[PDB]
Amino acid sequence: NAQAEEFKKYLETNGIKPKQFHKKELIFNQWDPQEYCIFLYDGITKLTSISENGTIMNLQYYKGAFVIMSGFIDTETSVGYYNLEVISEQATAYVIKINELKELLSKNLTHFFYVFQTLQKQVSYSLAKFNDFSINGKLGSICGQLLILTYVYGKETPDGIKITLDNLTMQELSSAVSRIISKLKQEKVIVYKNSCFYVQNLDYLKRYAPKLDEWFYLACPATWGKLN
Amino acid sequence: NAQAEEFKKYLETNGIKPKQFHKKELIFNQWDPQEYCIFLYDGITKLTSISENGTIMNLQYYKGAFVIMSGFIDTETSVGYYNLEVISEQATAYVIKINELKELLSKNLTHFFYVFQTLQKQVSYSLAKFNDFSINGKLGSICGQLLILTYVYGKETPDGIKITLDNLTMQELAVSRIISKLKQEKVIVYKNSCFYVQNLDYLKRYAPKLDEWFYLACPATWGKLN
Ligand code: NA
Ligand code: NA
Numbered sequence: 001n002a003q004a005e006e007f008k009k010y011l012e013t014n015g016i017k018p019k020q021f022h023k024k025e026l027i028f029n030q031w032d033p034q035e036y037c038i039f040l041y042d043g044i045t046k047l048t049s050i051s052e053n054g055t056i057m058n059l060q061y062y063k064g065a066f067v068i069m070s071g072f073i074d075t076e077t078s079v080g081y082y083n084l085e086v087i088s089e090q091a092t093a094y095v096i097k098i099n100e101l102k103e104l105l106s107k108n109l110t111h112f113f114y115v116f117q118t119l120q121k122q123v124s125y126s127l128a129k130f131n132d133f134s135i136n137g138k139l140g141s142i143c144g145q146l147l148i149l150t151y152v153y154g155k156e157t158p159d160g161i162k163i164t165l166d167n168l169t170m171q172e173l174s175s176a177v178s179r180i181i182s183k184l185k186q187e188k189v190i191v192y193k194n195s196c197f198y199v200q201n202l203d204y205l206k207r208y209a210p211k212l213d214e215w216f217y218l219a220c221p222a223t224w225g226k227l228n
Numbered sequence: 229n230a231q232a233e234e235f236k237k238y239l240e241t242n243g244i245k246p247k248q249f250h251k252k253e254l255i256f257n258q259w260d261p262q263e264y265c266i267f268l269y270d271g272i273t274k275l276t277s278i279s280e281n282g283t284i285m286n287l288q289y290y291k292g293a294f295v296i297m298s299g300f301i302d303t304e305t306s307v308g309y310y311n312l313e314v315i316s317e318q319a320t321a322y323v324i325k326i327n328e329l330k331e332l333l334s335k336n337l338t339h340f341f342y343v344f345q346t347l348q349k350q351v352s353y354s355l356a357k358f359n360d361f362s363i364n365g366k367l368g369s370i371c372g373q374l375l376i377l378t379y380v381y382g383k384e385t386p387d388g389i390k391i392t393l394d395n396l397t398m399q400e401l402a403v404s405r406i407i408s409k410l411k412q413e414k415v416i417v418y419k420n421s422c423f424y425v426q427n428l429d430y431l432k433r434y435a436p437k438l439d440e441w442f443y444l445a446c447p448a449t450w451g452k453l454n
Contacts, residue, residue: 047355051363052436059355074231074345078444079352080437106337113302113330116340119347120300124307126354127287131277134285211277211308218306 003114004065008041010111011094014104021091028070028095030081035071037101037115038084040064043091044169048083061173063152064092067118071098087172121219128215136208142180144209146190149173150199151216151223160191160198161227170197202227231342232293236269238339239322242332249319256298256323258309263299265329265343266312268292271319272397276311288350289401291380292320295346299326301333315400349445356441364434370406372435374416376442377401378425379449388417388426389453395421428453 018041021027027045028036040062047059047068059082062068071078076098096104105112132140149170154161163170184190189201199205206213217224240246246269249255256264258278270292277285287310290296300307304326324332333340360368374391381392391398410416415427425431432439443450 049359049437051359055363057359057362059359069348072345072348074341079348080355080441080444082355102337102341106340109330109334112333112340112344116344116347117300117302119344119351120297120307122351123347123354126351126358127275127308127310130354131285131287215308218308 001065004041007039007065007111007114008094010104010108011039011096016094016096018092018094021086021093023086023089025086027084027086027091027093029083030078035069035076035078035098037096037098038068038070039094039096040066040068041092041094043086043093044088045084045091045093046087048085049081061087067115069098073098073102088169124215124219125212128211131211132209135210138176139180140208140212142177142184143205143207144212145173146181146184146199147205147209147212148216150202150205151220151227154199154227156227157198159193159196160200161202163190163197163199167195167197229293232269235267235339235342236293236322238332238336239267239324244322244324246320246322249314249321251314251317253314253319255312255314255319255321257311260298263304263306263326264297265301265324265326266296266298267322267324268294268296268312269320269322271314271321272316273312273319273321274315274400276313277309278311289315295343297326297343301326301329316397317394352441352445353438356438359437360435363437366402366406368434368438370403370410371431372438373401374410374425375428375431375435375439378428378431379442379446379452382425382453385424388424389428391423391425393422398423 021043027038030049042064044061044063045068046061049057049059051057068084069079070082070084105115129141129144132144136143149163149165150161153163153165155164184204185192187201187204189204190197190199249271255266255268255273268290273290273296274286275288275290275296277287279285296312298307298310298312299305333343357369357372360372364371377391377393378389383390383392407416411418413430415425415430417424417426
């Protein structure tokens with residue numbers, strides 16, 4: 001990725017170095033009074049929150065390159081009691097205090113625009129997810145998630161669109177969800193063949209995740225067209 | 229709101245004047261190739277999506293002051309085929325072509341942050357709403373909507389906290405079943421054209437993460453009833 005590589009060299013040009021994290025580690029946590037801007041450069045993370053009793057609810061998944069803020073740019077206070085957990089075996093991230101990010105995005109605009117449009121992609125993503133859910137319930141939500149996994153890690157092969165993602169991460173990606181996923185398998189929308197998973201009915205996923213499909217077309221058109 | 233007013237002048241000083249809309253008008257629409265940055269200064273709007281067949285999906289409700297953008301600030305292309313419909317009787321919005329916003333946001337860090345910050349409020353709003361719904365179904369959802377409505381339009385009366393909003397405006401905000409259940413549980417009561425919330429702690433208990441979001445995003449108004 002190009003627009004994200006420039007942001008990386010903008011951070012390093014100002015002295016910020018990368019840190020390596022590993023599975024189950026938290027890049028930021030819900031109890032820290034200091035808030036940060038996380039430029040996730042490589043790896044897969046998930047935003048999590050603990051309810052009143054102790055149930056860990058998964059809120060959102062991110063893969064580098066991306067920008068996750070734990071605090072408001074202006075107030076520097078928390079946007080929510082959230083933790084950013086690594087779910088890939090390793091992850092590389094730049095950790096900037098919200099204190100200092102505001103000053104760095106002022107000295108430049110191409111890189112403010114970069115962080116600014118990631119927020120926009122998040123905003124529209126959630127609205128599209130909400131729209132698909134309101135129409136097809138969780139089926140649309142699960143088709144949508146599999147749709148973006150297909151567009152991101154998918155590559156066409158004779159057996160269909162092969163999801164080129166180690167299963168140790170895909171299994172990370174409860175009962176209501178497991179039933180839907182394997183009903184798609186029973187319907188041969190997605191199939192297992194020789195240690196790999198292939199999407200064999202792409203149009204099915206598009207049918208029940210239309211607004212997430214449109215979101216990806218609008219947000220990542222070049223990657224959308226590969227499989228369209 | 230302090231920061232909303234400082235942004236208002238910045239647009240006026242630079243030569244963008246407010247435009248008045250009335251109920252049912254679309255400040256922007258999903259078939260328009262020109263994308264805009266809308267600072268809705270006053271009034272209540274709703275973000276919709278219209279499919280080929282014509283159903284109007286209601287995606288989000290905004291109240292001024294807020295900022296809604298229909299295009300990406302860098303590519304200027306659509307972020308989604310949406311409309312911003314006015315649901316109150318009147319509304320006042322500053323309509324800026326997205327190309328022109330880049331100039332204004334380029335020359336100020338304070339006003340850039342204001343819009344940046346409101347996008348963050350939206351991201352965390354959606355996660356909180358998602359968290360509440362995955363733990364308490366639609367009950368927590370409507371409790372959340374009623375909660376923030378009570379927070380913004382709350383006015384104490386002898387018969388509970390009055391939701392000081394127009395009946396036609398709240399008419400525009402399954403669901404009915406939940407509302408009836410709420411009525412039969414000593415929570416919400418309807419009479420004389422408005423709703424009254426008598427047990428506000430009930431709503432906080434089933435909309436905890438959106439109560440947290442309101443606590444974290446809108447403290448001054450959160451402290452009204454806390
Ligand atoms: Na934190
Ligand atoms: Na439009």
